Design a protein around this nucleic acid. Structure first.
Ligand SMILES: [Ca+2]
Ligand SMILES: [Mn+2]
Ligand SMILES: [Mn+2]
Length: 430
DNA sequence: ATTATGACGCT
DNA sequence: AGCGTCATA
């Protein structure tokens, strides 16, 4: 009852750019705007692999991971933008720099956690308190929430999408307890007002549109964000969770999309997140471990305490390339040339990082895959990263992997290598 | 031949 | 440390 924590102490948002690499290319090339279009890497093999898809193209059934030749079968007028190639590999610099544009704007509002190239979490708890005292107990107008959905509304006793959105928003605002500075629903609402402002700032200053979720923790904020994309934001209140979770497939919740989520489903014989409430914490811990069990017990009730980490910059800088099928590297000269290509891009990014961010990487991680191995990585070895020099890094990388060569012939490499990966880690301030 | 990443957990 | 899981464009 009175001592039952309800996980309503924070206001957390997740902001995620719509079709992000597509928007980056559409900003650059106005001919691609408002068209079915996609971003592709490489070209020779089946027109290249698709990694981002505009909402116009999604309407034709175009998806990520599709070959462009195959996407063209669904959407013959599909427009394509190719990822840059440098040193024989895809180079994602344009998108990393565009990401920085967005992250720097968000950081003006609050501490952010960079969660991917195109999204960040925001802890808005403090900003909400300040906006609340500024408002002087004044009601919140629907005009301050022009792109917000309230999940679960309208309900109770119009056939247009925007009309439904407004109906739900009106019901929500009509009910609001604006006299209480500590009502969690009011706090989320003010959070949503700030996120409208954040999203308006991002679009004004970059041209990029985004969606957002506003809730009491990161998992619900992430889930909320996807409920009404593109170019909209969704408030998921504590109260909305039972109905929301009652038909929510378990795999939709962050961290349950894989083997663990599959095991929750199989072992417990359930399908939806809400069904987890019928197990004791000990029962869940017995099947899924102490940490996962406690997390599941609280999460199915809408409660999670994972903090928004103060981290705007990536913790690692990596360069990787696959060498599929017949392109697998079979000679020492081959392996060494590509290590050099990778190491040269890595040096470029590392040197830029050192100047921009006042830090230095101190460890080099080298990873490879061998033909025949199903695993993403076959072997991972580390060595010291003492100098930002590509020739040294590539020589060092070779030294730590060269004994993987099962060939009796030195010149040859067996089994052939189907992936190389160089990753700079363990940064220290400089 | 689904590619290039990046964070974090386990032992 | 090296490996595995889960995640996003
Ligand atoms: Ca996105
Ligand atoms: Mn994203
Ligand atoms: Mn996506």
């Amino acid at each position: 009852g009175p001592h039952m924590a309800t996980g309503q102490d924070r206001v957390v948002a997740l902001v995620d750019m719509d079709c992000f690499f597509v928007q980056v290319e559409q900003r650059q090339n106005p001919h691609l705007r408002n068209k079915p279009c996609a971003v592709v890497q490489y070209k020779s093999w089946k027109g290249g692999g698709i990694i981002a898809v505009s909402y116009e193209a999604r309407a034709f059934g175009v998806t990520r991971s599709m070959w462009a030749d195959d996407a063209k079968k669904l959407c013959p007028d599909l427009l394509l933008a190719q990822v840059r190639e440098s040193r024989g590999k895809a180079n994602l610099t344009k998108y990393r720099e565009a990401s920085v544009e967005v992250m720097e704007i968000m950081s003006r509002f609050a501490v952010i956690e960079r969660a991917s190239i195109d999204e960040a979490y925001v802890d808005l708890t403090s900003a909400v308190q300040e906006r609340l005292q500024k408002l002087q107990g004044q009601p919140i107008s629907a005009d301050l929430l022009p792109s917000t959905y309230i999940e679960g509304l309208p309900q109770g006793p119009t056939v247009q999408k925007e009309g439904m959105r407004k109906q739900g928003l009106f019901q929500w605002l009509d009910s609001l307890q604006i006299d209480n500075l500590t009502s969690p629903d009011l706090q989320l609402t003010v959070g949503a007002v700030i996120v409208e402002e954040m999203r308006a700032a991002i679009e004004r200053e970059t041209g990029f549109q985004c969606s957002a979720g506003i809730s009491h923790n990161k998992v619900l904020a992430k889930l909320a964000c996807g409920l009404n994309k593109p170019n909209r934001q969704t408030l998921v209140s504590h109260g909305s969770v039972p109905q929301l979770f009652s038909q929510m497939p378990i795999r939709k919740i962050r961290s349950l999309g894989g083997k663990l989520g599959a095991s929750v489903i199989e072992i417990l014989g359930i399908e939806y997140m809400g069904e987890l409430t019928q197990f004791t914490e000990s029962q869940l811990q017995s099947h899924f471990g102490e940490k996962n069990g406690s997390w599941l017990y609280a999460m199915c009730r809408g409660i999670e305490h994972d903090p928004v980490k103060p981290r705007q910059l990536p913790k690692t800088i990596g360069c990787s390339k696959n060498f599929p099928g017949k392109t697998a590297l079979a000679t020492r000269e081959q392996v060494q040339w590509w290590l050099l290509q990778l190491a040269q891009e890595l040096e470029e990014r590392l040197t830029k990082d050192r100047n921009d961010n006042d830090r230095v990487a101190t460890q080099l991680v080298v990873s490879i895959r061998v033909q025949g191995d199903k695993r993403l990585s076959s072997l991972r070895r580390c060595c010291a990263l003492t100098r930002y020099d590509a020739h040294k890094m590539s020589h060092d990388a070779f030294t730590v992997i060269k004994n993987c060569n099962t060939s009796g012939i030195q010149t040859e490499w067996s089994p052939p290598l189907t992936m190389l990966f160089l990753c700079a880690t363990k940064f220290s301030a400089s």
